[PDB]
Amino acid sequence: XXXXXYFREVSQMEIIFECLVDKEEADLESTSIDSVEWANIVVNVNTILKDMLHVACQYRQSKNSLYKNESGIQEPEHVPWTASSGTAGIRSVVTRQHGIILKVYPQADSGLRTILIEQLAALLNYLLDDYVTQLKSIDKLANEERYNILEMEYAQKRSELLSPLLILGQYAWASNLAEKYCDFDI
8 A cells, every 4th residue: 555654663573474374373273284275375475574574684784883883894794793784672563473383283183394493584584583682682781680680581481482482393493492592591
């Protein structure tokens, strides 16, 4: 219909195209391995949102500051900084990403490569959520340490649950998540 204002409000395009993916899954009839095109549409939507977030990550990597992310302006751009999108973590896009992570029941009965591709896309989503949380936690000052440690615990209680969805899942990308949220001791 229009895009001039949907560009200023392009965040909602993932709080709405995810509710639309749930509404399409409602008609999908995916009670078992029967539906396939429907489990491909959800992967398509997830990959679209993932590519949009990767575009935001590249637009936050192509920085201009002289000390913060100096690479890419005056130094060789062959060595980049933290791939965090510098996002501040709105509780709507955050909920949309966590809903896309919990929309994994179609992976129970689906193609072997399809489960791995959807797990790769959602792991890419988690390796951006964790990087944005790390940026927001690292930018904090020593003042207001109470809410700072509260956000720290909130990030830890999300890493410990992103390990839970990938507990029975692929072990090839657990190390990748461990390098992305680069402690991942638990």
